[PDB]
Amino acid sequence: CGETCVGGTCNTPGCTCSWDKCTRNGLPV
Numbered sequence: 001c002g003e004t005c006v007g008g009t010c011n012t013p014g015c016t017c018s019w020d021k022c023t024r025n026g027l028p029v
Contacts, residue, residue, distance in 0.1 A: 001014075001015035001022040001023065001024050001028070001029050002021070002022070002028050002029070003015055003021065003022035004020055004021050004022065005017035005020055005021065005022055006020070010022035012024075015029075
């Protein structure tokens with residue numbers, strides 16, 4: 001996803017917030 005999160009908020013559903021960035025499938029998709 002490559003997104004960013006302000007505490008844990010992600011845009012694309014399925015993207016998990018980690019280190020202020022949303023990853024997917026265990027990688028920054």
